[PDB]
Amino acid sequence: GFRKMAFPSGKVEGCMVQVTCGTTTLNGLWLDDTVYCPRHVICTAEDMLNPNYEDLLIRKSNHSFLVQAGNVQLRVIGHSMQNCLLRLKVDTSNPKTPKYKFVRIQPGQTFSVLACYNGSPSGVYQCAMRPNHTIKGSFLNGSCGSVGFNIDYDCVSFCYMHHMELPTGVHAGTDLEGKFYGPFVDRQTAQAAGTDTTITLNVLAWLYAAVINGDRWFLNRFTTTLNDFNLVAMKYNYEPLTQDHVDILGPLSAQTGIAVLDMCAALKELLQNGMNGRTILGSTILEDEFTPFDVVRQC
Amino acid sequence: GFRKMAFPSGKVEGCMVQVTCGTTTLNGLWLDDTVYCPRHVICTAEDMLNPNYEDLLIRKSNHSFLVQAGNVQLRVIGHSMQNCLLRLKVDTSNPKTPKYKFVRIQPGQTFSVLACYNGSPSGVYQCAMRPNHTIKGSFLNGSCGSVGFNIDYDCVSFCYMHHMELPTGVHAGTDLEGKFYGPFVDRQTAQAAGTDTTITLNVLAWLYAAVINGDRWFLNRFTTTLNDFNLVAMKYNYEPLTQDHVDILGPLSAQTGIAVLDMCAALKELLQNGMNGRTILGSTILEDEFTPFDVVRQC
Ligand SMILES: *[C@@H](C(=O)N(CCC(N)=O)NC(=O)[C@H](Cc1ccccc1)NC(=O)[C@H](CC(C)C)NC(=O)OCc1ccccc1)[C@H](O)C(=O)OCC
Numbered sequence: 338g339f340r341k342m343a344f345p346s347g348k349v350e351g352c353m354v355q356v357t358c359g360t361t362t363l364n365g366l367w368l369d370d371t372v373y374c375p376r377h378v379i380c381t382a383e384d385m386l387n388p389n390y391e392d393l394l395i396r397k398s399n400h401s402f403l404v405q406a407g408n409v410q411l412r413v414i415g416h417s418m419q420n421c422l423l424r425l426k427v428d429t430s431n432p433k434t435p436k437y438k439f440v441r442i443q444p445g446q447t448f449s450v451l452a453c454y455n456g457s458p459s460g461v462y463q464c465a466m467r468p469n470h471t472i473k474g475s476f477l478n479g480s481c482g483s484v485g486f487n488i489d490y491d492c493v494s495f496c497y498m499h500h501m502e503l504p505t506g507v508h509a510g511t512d513l514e515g516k517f518y519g520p521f522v523d524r525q526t527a528q529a530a531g532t533d534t535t536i537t538l539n540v541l542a543w544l545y546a547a548v549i550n551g552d553r554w555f556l557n558r559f560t561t562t563l564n565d566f567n568l569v570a571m572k573y574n575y576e577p578l579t580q581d582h583v584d585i586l587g588p589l590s591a592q593t594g595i596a597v598l599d600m601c602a603a604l605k606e607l608l609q610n611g612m613n614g615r616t617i618l619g620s621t622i623l624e625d626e627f628t629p630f631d632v633v634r635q636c
Numbered sequence: 637g638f639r640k641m642a643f644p645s646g647k648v649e650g651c652m653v654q655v656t657c658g659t660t661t662l663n664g665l666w667l668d669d670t671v672y673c674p675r676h677v678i679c680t681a682e683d684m685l686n687p688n689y690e691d692l693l694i695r696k697s698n699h700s701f702l703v704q705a706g707n708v709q710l711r712v713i714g715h716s717m718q719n720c721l722l723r724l725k726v727d728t729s730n731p732k733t734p735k736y737k738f739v740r741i742q743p744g745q746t747f748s749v750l751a752c753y754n755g756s757p758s759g760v761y762q763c764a765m766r767p768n769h770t771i772k773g774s775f776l777n778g779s780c781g782s783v784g785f786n787i788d789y790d791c792v793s794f795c796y797m798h799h800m801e802l803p804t805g806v807h808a809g810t811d812l813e814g815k816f817y818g819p820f821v822d823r824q825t826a827q828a829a830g831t832d833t834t835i836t837l838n839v840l841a842w843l844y845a846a847v848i849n850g851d852r853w854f855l856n857r858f859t860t861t862l863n864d865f866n867l868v869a870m871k872y873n874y875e876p877l878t879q880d881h882v883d884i885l886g887p888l889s890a891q892t893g894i895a896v897l898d899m900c901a902a903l904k905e906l907l908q909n910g911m912n913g914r915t916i917l918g919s920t921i922l923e924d925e926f927t928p929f930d931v932v933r934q935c
């Protein structure tokens with residue numbers, strides 16, 4: 338009984354619109370009287386390579402942007418750019434605008450994604466920002482403009498807007514200020530993602546989730562120093578854990594009574610001597626897409 | 637009595653060499669039997685724009701790399717690339733190699749820079765990784781290959797190698813695995829740095845340094861919520877403070893007896909109603925290049 342769960346998506350659902358320029362349609366986010374969407378809505382087929390966006394934008398009329406909420410057009414009366422996003426000023430304030438913030442997320446942090454085509458929601462899934470600033474999503478042509486978010490009590494924190502699919506089939510996007518996560522750019526030029534690594538802080542959190550859920554077999558038989566843990570773990574392509582991360586595990590260490598370095602030690606033995614044929618929470622493989630915050634949430 | 641201080645530079649001084657290819661000479665770092673240096677040592681004048689480094693490297697002989705420690709050549713017997721760095725295998729193990737680690741640093745963290753020309757040290761200064769992944773250094777033509785570092789007890793943590801000067805006169809570089817900090821690339825093409833912001837976590841730390849040093853006038857007359865602090869501060873181009881940062885100030889909050897949100901409140905009033913004609917630690921301006929760790933260190 339421990340599962341990836343998404344946030345309920347209803348509050349974000351009533352912000353989703355479609356935005357069409359020419360023959361190209363993608364998703365936008367409608368909040369108050371603004372629609373946010375990827376500025377590549379404005380590109381034609383023959384210049385996705387080196388689009389001059391500010392030149393393409395300045396020659397475009399308000400009327401060229403067809404914005405629809407369901408069957409209902411929303412007249413665009415302003416447009417401007419914000420980094421890699423467009424802000425379109427519309428007709429009408431979204432009567433469904435929830436309480437919201439725009440947040441820029443850190444590598445390792447998880448959010449829910451509401452996957453959309455043609456302004457309509459298809460599904461919600463939970464994922465993470467990877468150490469290499471990509472995300473492992475599930476997105477098809479037309480997904481661009483889909484948003485990632487977290488929700489606390491009554492406030493939607495928007496953190497992600499989908500822009501690109503990499504050659505390896507992972508994904509890249511921006512915050513809601515239009516700023517890319519990672520060294521990526523919105524044009525179809527040859528780029529390169531960093532080698533990815535395992536989110537160590539998250540794998541520990543999920544080992545704490547296991548203990549809380551009653552799973553104890555892998556508890557540590559040997560001791561470790563922070564440094565000695567890092568020397569082994571890096572070899573398995575795990576992120577270095579810093580003292581800042583150690584400090585992040587304090588509350589789960591306090592609630593379980595397992596010192597953070599004792600769990601670091603369990604993790605080392607797991608990697609080395611392993612489950613080999615064993616499971617933790619019913620899982621082969623060490624799960625690295627739950628934060629300390631998610632564990633505390635769902636437990 | 638509170639000053640920017642650099643780490644003593646002696647341990648890093650005996651790692652500094654010069655590396656010359658053709659007519660181009662820069663600095664390298666000699667540890668054990670490897671010299672690390674920026675791979676742009678290999679570029680000629682007419683292709684700094686789009687250097688094909690792996691092609692330029694593969695056609696280069698070991699002998700083309702002239703490496704000198706003082707007056708003394710060190711024969712290069714291997715070369716390879718690692719991201720934006722070269723690793724040259726040499727003759728001789730540095731008898732002056734200290735205890736060391738390679739660390740990748742976070743925005744906001746400070747290190748000392750040992751500025752070098754032609755393998756010789758000229759000066760040391762303390763600085764920070766900016767939220768926009770540049771550094772505000774003092775570097776002239778030939779500085780490339782200079783290193784940033786921290787030292788704890790007896791171990792040198794290398795974090796930075798200098799590569800580029802931006803149009804605005806700030807600076808860009810890599811970790812010691814050759815990976816750029818920030819979305820920058822080592823070629824003289826048109827690029828762009830993010831708008832920079834003030835390191836909030838650091839300005840608070842420096843207000844704690846003030847209290848410890850006996851400066852109390854600006855202590856808060858009104859209260860604040862984390863959120864309400866952020867709403868004001870962002871307006872002054874300060875980074876958002878997260879709960880993770882709040883947690884980082886715990887020990888200085890414990891040692892001074894000033895709750896972190898009380899200091900957040902002081903900072904808000906300072907920004908709004910201000911020192912206007914007043915000083916804190918003898919400073920006009922709020923200093924944002926000391927970490928919580930530096931304050932605790934020098935206090
Ligand atoms: C928009 C859309 O749905 N998506 C995502 C589709 C998906 N499977 O996730 N976005 C795109 O398809 C991008 C459109 C675009 C963006 C900017 C400028 C021009 C066009 N294009 C890509 O994602 C493209 C996919 C190709 C199959 C390669 N990505 C790249 O070029 O990768 C660059 C790169 C990154 C890192 C390493 C190497 C290379 C829908 O396509 C749409 O409406 O487009 C309007 C133009």
Ligand SMILES: *[C@@H](C(=O)N(CCC(N)=O)NC(=O)[C@H](Cc1ccccc1)NC(=O)[C@H](CC(C)C)NC(=O)OCc1ccccc1)[C@H](O)C(=O)OCC
Pocket residue numbers: 660661662676677679683684685687775776777778779780799800801802803807820822823824825826827828829
């Ligand atoms: C190496 C050297 O000393 N420095 C730094 C000098 C300093 N003042 O800090 N490095 C360079 O000069 C870079 C050399 C280089 C790097 C890669 C490929 C080719 C050459 N060049 C630059 O720093 C250059 C400076 C020009 C005056 C603009 N920078 C850029 O091109 O900026 C790119 C950019 C970034 C962000 C926004 C916009 C643009 C010494 O120069 C040497 O030995 O060179 C060997 C080639």
